[PDB]
Amino acid sequence: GSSGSSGMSTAADLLRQGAACSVLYLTSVETESLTGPQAVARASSAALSCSPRPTPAVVHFKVSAQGITLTDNQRKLFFRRHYPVNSITFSSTDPQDRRWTNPDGTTSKIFGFVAKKPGSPWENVCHLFAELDPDQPAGAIVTFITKVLLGQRKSGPSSG
């Protein structure tokens, strides 16, 4: 039970704005049973619980109405993978607001989303990520997603 009408005024304005850059791949955990704002919390807990700490890698991140596309240049765990927009149902910075102390000696905001496996719809798996560059902070990333993918009115104002 939940009332309310989304503010889907216009998507054009949203599309006009796009964010694409490299991100920090932390780790992905299967949420077969987990889901929603919780699934994202699990991975985080499992990211610090398991040791020694995981070895994150730099990859590419793109936010499009078609979903979410990723591309790496290391060719270790994978080459190129993308998920359809009909899958991604949730996406937002980790709730535990935990930080990932990079191997360089600094902390970064942890963020991730939850989508259905490309091989099995009944199998859920969340992907943990971390802030790579300052220019494009996690908040600015996840947000854009929940704005388009999901469909939530704009936060910041705008004249004209």
Q: What is the CATH number of the domain that holds 133?
A: 2.30.29.30
Residue 67, φ and ψ in degrees, nearest 5: 125, -130
**How was it solved?**
NMR
Residue 64 counted as domain residue? yes
d(CA 99, CA 70): 22
- Whether 77 maps to a domain, the answer reads yes
**Taking a C-beta distance cutoff of 8 angstroms, is the pair 74, 57 a contact?**
yes
**Strand ranges for 42-153 from DSSP E:** 57-64, 67-72, 80-84, 90-93, 110-116, 124-130
CA distance 18 to 6: 22
Whether 93 and 100 have beta carbons less than 8 Å apart is answered as: no
User: What total number of domains does the chain contain?
Assistant: 1
Helices (H), 67-160: 138-145
Chain-centroid distance of CA 57 in Å reads: 15
- The token duo for 106 is 């600094």
